[PDB]
Amino acid sequence: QPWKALDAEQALYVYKRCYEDHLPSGSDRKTYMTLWNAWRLEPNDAITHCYAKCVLTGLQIYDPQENAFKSDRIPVQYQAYKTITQSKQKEVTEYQKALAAANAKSGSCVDLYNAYLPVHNRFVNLSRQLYHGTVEGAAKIYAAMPEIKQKGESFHAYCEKRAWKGNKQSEWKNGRRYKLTGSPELKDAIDCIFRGLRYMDDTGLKVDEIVRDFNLINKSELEPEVRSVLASCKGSEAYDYYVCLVNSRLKQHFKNAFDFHELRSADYAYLLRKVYENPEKVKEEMKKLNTTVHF
Numbered sequence: 648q649p650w651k652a653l654d655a656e657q658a659l660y661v662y663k664r665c666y667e668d669h670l671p672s673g674s675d676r677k678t679y680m681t682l683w684n685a686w687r688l689e690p691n692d693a694i695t696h697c698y699a700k701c702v703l704t705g706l707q708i709y710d711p712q713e714n715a716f717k718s719d720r721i722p723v724q725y726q727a728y729k730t731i732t733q734s735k736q737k738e739v740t741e742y743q744k745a746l747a748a749a750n751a752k753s754g755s756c757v758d759l760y761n762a763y764l765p766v767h768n769r770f771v772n773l774s775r776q777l778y779h780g781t782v783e784g785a786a787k788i789y790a791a792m793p794e795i796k797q798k799g800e801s802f803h804a805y806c807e808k809r810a811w812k813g814n815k816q817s818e819w820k821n822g823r824r825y826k827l828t829g830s831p832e833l834k835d836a837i838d839c840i841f842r843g844l845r846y847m848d849d850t851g852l853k854v855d856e857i858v859r860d861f862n863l864i865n866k867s868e869l870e871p872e873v874r875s876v877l878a879s880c881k882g883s884e885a886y887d888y889y890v891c892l893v894n895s896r897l898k899q900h901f902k903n904a905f906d907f908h909e910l911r912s913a914d915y916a917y918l919l920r921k922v923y924e925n926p927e928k929v930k931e932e933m934k935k936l937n938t939t940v941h942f
């Protein structure tokens with residue numbers, strides 16, 4: 648439309664969300680994480696198969712609507728960061744071509760895993776350069792592109808910095824609160840945050856993502872109320888939904904869910920080993936990072 652390359656934060660989001668959605672719980676967690684951290688598509692079972700599908704989909708190498716590997720996106724991803732990665736054009740073309748040969752078949756987890764596996768085995772190092780899959784390589788991207796939300800920085804803090812960048816004092820100067828002012832700066836900050844938390848994207852509202860945040864604070868029973876509050880909200884801007892949630896019977900639960908996501912948005916590894924404890928613990932953890940917490 649044309650296709651837009653993914654930055655380091657966008658790639659990190661894909662990796663961490665796929666870990667969250669595919670890592671097993673219990674003793675098996677460490678085993679899979681050790682292999683996947685090393686970029687090994689092992690073991691050869693359904694857990695890894697669907698993890699692979701998740702990452703291919705998130706990096707937009709696989710398109711689920713077309714059920715197709717999108718070979719021509721690889722050179723686009725390369726071109727966007729080539730001065731930083733120093734990846735070789737010859738190898739990029741070879742990677743593109745290997746993807747063009749790949750057969751998605753049904754698009755099932757195993758079909759995509761089987762098709763992608765030899766491509767991965769051949770081009771793993773290049774793929775980690777192109778898609779910001781090394782700590783050192785990603786660091787170069789953040790250093791060259793200060794406009795990307797950094798690791799350790801919450802979306803709320805990143806967005807605050809860009810919403811209040813003039814003479815007017817930030818509404819969150821003493822710490823972020825839930826005061827509803829309807830100011831242009833607050834509306835901007837909230838739009839930036841909703842997009843950063845994947846509550847909204849270019850296709851609009853993601854009701855399921857907001858529900859996920861309530862599930863993550865152990866409030867699964869509130870799902871129908873979360874859906875109802877969003878559904879009855881007049882207006883379709885991020886700020887409108889935020890106002891609807893804050894002014895509803897869900898108020899305190901939303902604050903807890905949104906605050907927990909602030910923490911998680913600063914530390915993309917947070918859930919990958921820790922679970923939700925309580926609001927006071929969240930606040931203490933946020934003090935260690937670049938967040939909008941009260942000190």
Ligand SMILES: CCCCC/C=C\C\C=C/C=C/C=C/C[C@@H](O)CCCC(=O)O
Nearest residue numbers: 662683686699702703774780781782785
């Ligand atoms: C490039 C397409 C790969 C599709 C195959 C599916 C998964 C690849 C395997 C493992 C991925 C592990 C991702 C770990 C995240 C890590 O690489 C992020 C490093 C950057 C950072 O931590 O700052």
